[PDB]
Design an enzyme around this catalytic site. Structure first.
Site, PDB file in Angstrom:
ATOM      1  N   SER B  47       0.799  -1.227   0.000  1.00 48.93           N
ATOM      2  CA  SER B  47       0.000   0.000   0.000  1.00 48.93           C
ATOM      3  C   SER B  47       0.838   1.288   0.000  1.00 48.93           C
ATOM      4  CB  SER B  47      -0.931   0.070   1.198  1.00 48.93           C
ATOM      5  OG  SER B  47      -1.934  -0.947   1.095  1.00 48.93           O
ATOM      6  N   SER B  95      -6.618   2.830   3.119  1.00 40.12           N
ATOM      7  CA  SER B  95      -5.875   1.961   2.212  1.00 40.12           C
ATOM      8  C   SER B  95      -6.799   1.091   1.335  1.00 40.12           C
ATOM      9  CB  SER B  95      -4.891   1.174   3.070  1.00 40.12           C
ATOM     10  OG  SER B  95      -3.637   1.229   2.496  1.00 40.12           O
ATOM     11  N   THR B 186       1.489   3.556   5.469  1.00 38.19           N
ATOM     12  CA  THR B 186       1.772   2.196   5.852  1.00 38.19           C
ATOM     13  C   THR B 186       1.591   1.254   4.660  1.00 38.19           C
ATOM     14  OG1 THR B 186      -0.536   2.031   6.621  1.00 38.19           O
ATOM     15  CG2 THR B 186       1.132   2.318   8.292  1.00 38.19           C
ATOM     16  N   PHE B 188       1.432  -3.390   3.931  1.00 41.40           N
ATOM     17  CA  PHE B 188       1.477  -4.761   4.451  1.00 41.40           C
ATOM     18  C   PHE B 188       1.148  -5.729   3.290  1.00 41.40           C
ATOM     19  CE2 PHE B 188      -1.204  -8.017   6.965  1.00 41.40           C
ATOM     20  CZ  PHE B 188      -0.121  -8.861   7.141  1.00 41.40           C
ATOM     21  N   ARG B 230       5.383  -2.154  13.010  1.00 42.28           N
ATOM     22  CA  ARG B 230       5.775  -1.340  11.874  1.00 42.28           C
ATOM     23  C   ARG B 230       5.760   0.134  12.194  1.00 42.28           C
ATOM     24  NH1 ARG B 230       0.722  -1.844   7.602  1.00 42.28           N
ATOM     25  NH2 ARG B 230      -0.816  -1.015   9.114  1.00 42.28           N
TER      26      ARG B 230
END
Ligand SMILES: *C(=O)N1C[C@H](NOS(=O)(=O)O)CC[C@H]1C(N)=O
Ligand SMILES: *C(=O)N1C[C@H](NOS(=O)(=O)O)CC[C@H]1C(N)=O
Ligand SMILES: [Co+2]
Ligand SMILES: [Co+2]
Ligand SMILES: [Co+2]
Ligand SMILES: [Co+2]
Lengths: 246, 245
Positions: B47, B95, B186, B188, B230
């Site tokens: 993302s 996201s 962020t 993932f 994170r």
């Protein structure tokens, strides 16, 4: 394009013994609500809320070079320790560094300042009282209704200024970020005035919340600096009770 | 230049994490990191790709403008938070993959490739499917290259209009305090296996006082319960450096 009185918000004012007004408008419906229609239209000294148009004008006229302009602290003494430092545009807005904006105003000058305040339909457009203080102790006055109108034009990039400069100032006004909403805002405080003729404190801004946008303007009479946190706490409680923030 | 600071490894060992933090003050000319080799190792962006994808979308006119609303068609999407109309900042902050998949489709392969070359964006490999290259394809980018890319965005030096750069910058604001703004994103990729783990990212910059700090974190991940590291590992490193908090 409507406004309605909702006198129930008055509870948050009366609890803190405050004489003031809150205006809250939903962009999608063009609908505003206020505790006090009369005070919503009363015009007060903008004080540090004038940093919004002054910043836009500063950028438009080239007096502020760009987004990453640093306003250097030449080093001499000043009225707040927080001003005795180099500042970015956001820093100078956020700390409300008066001498930075006084210099910007002087460099813009009276003819250009007048022109831009006409274009922006900014209050009574009266800049008499000294080019470097008309917004703090001069004759310039603006209402809560007019503040919301002005901020909506800014949000929509519809002020007579470049899109880029409007965008620069918008980012500088971000004061709270959460995953579901961004708050853009600006405080102001004209002083304590007299107990007969109190000063004014402001909190103006907008909340970008999901797909809706809420424009707001708060002001209150103030004669003791101890009351200054109410300029954020009253509208914050209102907006929380409406589900907009928090 | 990139300089190793092995004291930062404390924050990794404590959590048994294999990862890297890259932190650069003022510019990317000199960066500090816990792991010199991993700083330049390239991983799926996941993302974090929303940043270039947003810029490209605006540049091409696929995203019409700053106030674009991405309408939900009412069909199931993989997260409930995506099942609603979204603004650009909304779609970035939650996201919302499908919104960005559709942006990518409309941009198309030819323009996507052109812009990733202009941006010097990782290995620039978009092959295997226009709507999933950054999710499961061959695209890879390092922490160093993320810092360079973000520095260019901050400076409005990407090959895109200043306006569109400013739009995306504001959409990336994730923390505001009187002394600083944090712009960040962020990512993932997923858990893969214990032998072949996924990757988690936190990238961004902090505008503080008159200083700017660019940052990029990634770590190997094979269990979603580890995902909050994170943010917490780099936040702790930046807090110890006095940059935030
Ligand atoms: C603006 O109202 N001012 C500049 C500075 N900050 O005020 S604020 O925190 O209420 O925005 C000092 C007070 C005030 C002024 N000009 O007197
Ligand atoms: C991006 O990496 N993804 C989309 C969405 N949010 O990502 S984030 O929380 O890691 O920033 C869910 C996870 C992931 C994906 N593609 O599943
Ligand atoms: Co001019
Ligand atoms: Co905004
Ligand atoms: Co490793
Ligand atoms: Co910024």
């Amino acid at each position: 394009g409507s406004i309605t009185e909702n006198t129930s918000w008055n509870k948050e004012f009366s609890a803190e013994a405050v004489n003031g007004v809150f205006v809250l408008c939903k962009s999608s419906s063009k609908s505003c609500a206020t505790n006090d229609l009369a005070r919503a239209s009363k015009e007060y000294l903008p004080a540090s809320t004038f940093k919004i148009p002054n910043a836009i004008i500063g950028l438009e006229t080239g007096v502020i070079k760009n987004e990453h302009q640093v306003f250097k602290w030449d080093g001499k003494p000043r009225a707040m320790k927080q001003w005795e430092r180099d500042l970015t545009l956001r820093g100078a807005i956020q700390v409300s560094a008066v001498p930075v904006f006084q210099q910007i105003a002087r460099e813009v000058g009276e003819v250009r300042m007048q022109k831009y305040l006409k274009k922006f339909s900014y209050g009574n457009q009266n800049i008499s009282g000294g080019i470097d203080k008309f917004w703090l102790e001069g004759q310039l006055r603006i209402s809560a209704v007019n503040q919301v109108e002005f901020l909506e034009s800014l949000y929509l990039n519809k002020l007579s200024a470049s899109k880029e400069n409007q965008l620069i100032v918008k980012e500088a006004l971000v004061t709270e970020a959460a995953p579901e909403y961004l708050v853009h805002s600006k405080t102001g405080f004209s002083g304590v005035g007299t107990e007969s003729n109190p000063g004014v404190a402001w909190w103006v801004g907008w909340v970008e919340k999901e797909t809706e946008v809420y424009f707001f303007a708060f002001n209150m009479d103030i004669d003791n600096e101890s009351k200054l946190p109410l300029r954020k706490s009253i509208p914050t409680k209102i907006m929380e009770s409406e589900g907009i923030i928090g």
